[PDB]
């Protein structure tokens, strides 16, 4: 049980789930500065 | 609204240093976040309400 810490000091399954939802929320706020074919992307200019 | 720039939220004094020829900063994700008064020349932070 000692070898154990020796193999930590593994984890990629938990930080790919922080990984996708960090870059589902960085991609959404990231498409607000699309204009999609429109004469500006923001709606009071 | 700052000599073009507008917007909403409060105004507080930052601790940024801008180059000596830069108006305003961004963040990540390119959103305004400081803006230099042209009158005093100080850097102030933009936070949302």
Known sequence: ?45 | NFNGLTGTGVLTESNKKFLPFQQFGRDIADTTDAVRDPQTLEILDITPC
């Open chain 1, 1 to 45: 049980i000692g070898k154990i810490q020796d193999s930590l000091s593994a984890l990629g399954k938990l930080q790919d789930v922080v990984n996708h939802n960090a870059q589902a929320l960085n991609t959404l706020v990231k498409q607000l500065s699309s204009k999609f074919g429109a004469i500006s992307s923001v709606l009071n200019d």
